[PDB]
């Protein structure tokens, strides 16, 4: 399935993460995971400059040289060195940060440029003005955010609208059956601005895929190096598993098919480290959960909150009954 990312550019329902392409996966296995992804019919690569110190981008860049169209996304904001202006949404750092993602990807235009995180030190106006100048220059097509809060998305959107700049297209949050707190302020804020979600960590870092042996709950390997903030967790993993094998499919596969069908979601980022793991994740394309499986999964992962701003009672009093 093809969707837009709040713009005219369409993109396939699954996105290829490339975090692994320097740390764990080597460049040859990276090229073949990408070759598989394409051959499965994807057109969406997500990378970052800080992924393996930009090696991640260079492998993607070399693979684009070998292959002769794909929608490419990358990010800024995080430390590329240990200096004080080697991080930040300042236009000084972002200016070289975009030039270096450009030379490392060997493209002349990045399709999606993303702020990897909010930056309280840079005024948002400076950042958005830098991104609009980049759009005018043909260095980037669109921009979006990752790890912005709700009110922060809302302030950016309207500040862009106030200065006749382009609108943000996407938000890249962490979102899976275990990590659903973006539904209180961040999702409402994107839906209000017609924006699309790009969820990453859809297997919750492994907790949802099984592959363990009824593990210990504070095991730091699968997640965070703490193993339970939201990674009850065991009930969710269990429900996912039951639905998994009655449908004759992997537990990973119905968790993936759960994220792809949630409101506002344009494309899920896949963290395949292997060719086989890519095949195991892309099996979820065939799975389409029924309205019931999903409303099941929804309520068992429903993030309960202290009553006032984001739990039952505050929600209920913000609601307006039509009657």
Q: Of 73, 63, 78, give the one whose Cα is nearest residue 27.
A: 63
Does 144 sit near Cl ion (CB under 5 A)? no
Q: Choose the stretch contacting Cl ion; rule: CB under 5 A; options: 8-16, 97-105, 117-125, 175-183.
A: 8-16
Please give the size of the binding site for Cl ion, defined by CB under 5 A. Answer: 2
Nearer to Cl ion, 124 or 195 (CB): 195
Q: Of 161, 230, 175, give the one whose Cα is nearest residue 203.
A: 175
Compute the least distance from the CB of residue 231 to Na ion, in Å: 23
**Contact partner at residue 260 from Cl ion, Na ion, none, CB < 5 to 8 Å by partner kind:** Na ion
**Contact partner at residue 305 from Cl ion, Na ion, none, CB < 5 to 8 Å by partner kind:** none
Please give the size of the binding site for Na ion, defined by CB under 5 A. Answer: 4
| Alpha helices in the chain, H assignment, sequence order | 20-23, 27-39, 55-66, 91-105, 124-137, 150-162, 186-192, 233-246, 251-260, 275-282, 291-300, 307-310, 312-318
Which residue in the list 14, 37, 51, 142 is annotated as catalytic?
51
For residue 202, what are its two tokens? 């859809």
Rounded Cα distance, 201 and 147, in Å: 13
For residue 256, what are its two tokens? 């993936």
Residue 28, judged by CB atoms within 10 A of its CB (0-12, 13-18, 19+), counts as exposed
Q: Choose the stretch contacting Cl ion; rule: CB under 5 A; options: 6-14, 156-164, 219-227, 280-288.
A: 6-14
CB atoms within 10 A of CB 307: 12
Residue nearest to Na ion (CB): 3
Contact track, Na ion, 242-281, x by CB under 5 A? ------------------xx--------------------
Residue with tokens 């297997």: 203
**Contact partner at residue 202 from Cl ion, Na ion, none, CB < 5 to 8 Å by partner kind:** none
Compute the least distance from the CB of residue 186 to Na ion, in Å: 20
Pairing of strands 140-146, 10-12: unpaired
Q: Is there a catalytic annotation at residue 51?
A: yes
Compute the least distance from the CB of residue 148 to Na ion, in Å: 22
Q: What is the phi/psi pair of residue 144, to 5°?
A: -150, -170
Decide if 145 contacts 115 (C-beta within 8 A).
yes
Q: Which of 1, 2, 3, 5 binds Cl ion (CB under 5 A)?
A: 5
Nearer to Cl ion, 154 or 170 (CB): 170
Active site amino acids: 51
Sites of contact with Na ion (CB under 5 A) = 3-4, 260-261
Sites of contact with Cl ion (CB under 5 A) = 5, 11
């Amino acid at each position: 399935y093809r969707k837009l990312g709040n713009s005219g550019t369409v993109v396939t329902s699954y996105c290829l993460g490339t975090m692994t392409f320097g740390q764990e996966t080597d460049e040859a296995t990276s090229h073949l995971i990408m070759d598989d992804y394409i051959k499965a019919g994807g057109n969406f690569i997500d990378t970052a400059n800080v992924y393996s110190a930009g090696v991640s981008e260079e492998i993607v860049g070399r693979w684009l040289k070998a292959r002769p169209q794909v929608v490419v996304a990358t990010k800024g904001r995080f430390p590329m060195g240990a200096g004080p202006n080697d991080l930040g949404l300042s236009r000084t750092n972002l200016n070289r940060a975009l030039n270096d993602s450009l030379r490392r990807l060997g493209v002349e235009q990045i399709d999606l440029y993303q702020m990897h995180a909010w930056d309280a030190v840079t005024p948002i106006e400076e950042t958005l003005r830098f991104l609009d100048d980049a759009v005018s220059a043909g260095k980037i097509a669109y921009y979006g955010f990752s790890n912005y809060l709700g009110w922060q998305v809302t302030k950016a959107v309207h500040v862009a609208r106030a200065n006749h700049w382009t609108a943000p297209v996407t938000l890249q949050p962490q979102y899976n059956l275990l990590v659903r707190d973006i539904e209180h302020e961040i999702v409402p804020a994107c839906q209000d601005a017609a924006m699309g979600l790009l969820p990453w960590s859809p297997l919750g870092g492994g907790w949802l895929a099984g592959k363990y042996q009824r593990d210990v709950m504070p095991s730091g390997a699968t997640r965070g190096e703490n193993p339970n903030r939201g990674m009850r967790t065991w009930q969710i993993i269990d429900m996912v598993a039951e639905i998994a094998k009655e449908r004759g499919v992997s537990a990973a596969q119905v968790a993936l098919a759960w994220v792809v069908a949630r409101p506002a979601v344009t494309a899920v980022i896949l963290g395949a480290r292997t060719r086989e793991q890519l095949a195991d994740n892309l099996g979820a394309v065939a799975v389409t959960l029924s309205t019931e499986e999903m409303e099941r999964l929804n309520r068992v992962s429903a993030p309960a909150m202290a009553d006032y701003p984001y739990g039952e009672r505050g929600v209920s009093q913000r609601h307006r009954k039509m009657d």
